[PDB]
Write a protein that binds this ligand. Structure first.
Ligand SMILES: CCn1nccc1-c1c[nH]c2ncc(-c3ccc(N)c(C(=O)N(C)C)c3)cc12
Length: 266
């Protein structure tokens, strides 16, 4: 297809993100003198399905695919490079006078827009967190999208036996029954909002992941962050409803943040 390109078009550089994303490298697309990111493979079929799914997604707030090398090993997935790294590091290291409350709303609006798109297009993310959001110039935020999966909105995924989850971002039904859906993404988005409001604090601070589920069962939820508007905290708490069906849609979340962002600018 039009996505296929030569490996020789790319000059490979160093591993990006301190190697936290696995085999993702900085690279140069020589034709365009352009810094790109490249995912390589050091299981093959799973990797090739990733490349296939990314061909289908197009949204200003999801990392854009640029090309693939899928004819012969080693395989490449070539994607745009996000200059300011991940949102977690960005928020932790930022000038808070620049990255103010209205900017926090802007970033939340961008992420919910990408998620509304996936919701509409029958996709599920399954690993939403600040570490998996990426930052460009002028507070542009794009959701990392290697592992996106096809799943009709409403339908459920059951994880493989012995699967390990990032517990503090993981919905109760996922933790107990390995069940994932667009509503578990909504839960994770709530934890992401908490990350944003606190400028990259670790969720449930001081609480060992092994004790999180039992807290959630007894109706414990994280406290409202300092300086966080109650209307935003209300959305967080709605995302953390025990029953997946009680949680709002990403369409509703995005509408809420759009309204709030527009009012904050005015
Ligand atoms: C498909 C989306 N995705 N999934 C995993 C990785 C990416 C990704 C795509 N494009 C990227 N562009 C940049 C980065 C990234 C993240 C954190 C970092 N500390 C750095 C970094 O070292 N510098 C030079 C800023 C780079 C990650 C990605």
């Amino acid at each position: 297809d039009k996505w296929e390109m030569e490996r020789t078009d790319i000059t490979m550089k160093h591993k990006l993100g301190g190697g936290q994303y696995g085999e993702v490298y900085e690279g140069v697309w020589k034709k365009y003198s352009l810094t790109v990111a490249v995912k390589t493979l050091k299981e093959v079929e799973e990797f090739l399905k990733e490349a296939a799914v990314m061909k289908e997604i197009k949204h200003p707030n999801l990392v854009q695919l640029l090309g693939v090398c899928t004819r012969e090993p080693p395989f490449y997935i070539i994607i745009e490079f996000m200059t300011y790294g991940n949102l977690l590091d960005y928020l932790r290291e930022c000038n808070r006078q620049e990255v103010s409350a209205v900017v926090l709303l802007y970033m939340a609006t961008q992420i919910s827009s990408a998620m509304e798109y996936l919701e509409k297009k029958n996709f599920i993310h399954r690993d939403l967190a600040a570490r998996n959001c990426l930052v460009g110039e002028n507070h542009l935020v794009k959701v990392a999208d290697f592992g996106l999966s096809r799943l009709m909105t409403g339908d459920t995924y059951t994880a493989h036996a012995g699967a390990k989850f990032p517990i503090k971002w993981t919905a109760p039904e996922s933790l107990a029954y390995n069940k994932f859906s667009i509503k578990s993404d909504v839960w994770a988005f709530g934890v992401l909002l908490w990350e944003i409001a606190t400028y990259g604090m670790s969720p449930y601070p001081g609480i060992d992941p092994s004790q999180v589920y039992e807290l959630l069962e007894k109706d414990y939820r994280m406290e409202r962050p300092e300086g966080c508007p109650e209307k935003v905290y209300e959305l967080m708490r709605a995302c953390w409803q025990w029953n997946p069906s009680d949680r709002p849609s990403f369409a509703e979340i995005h509408q809420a943040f759009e309204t709030m962002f527009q009012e904050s600018s005015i």
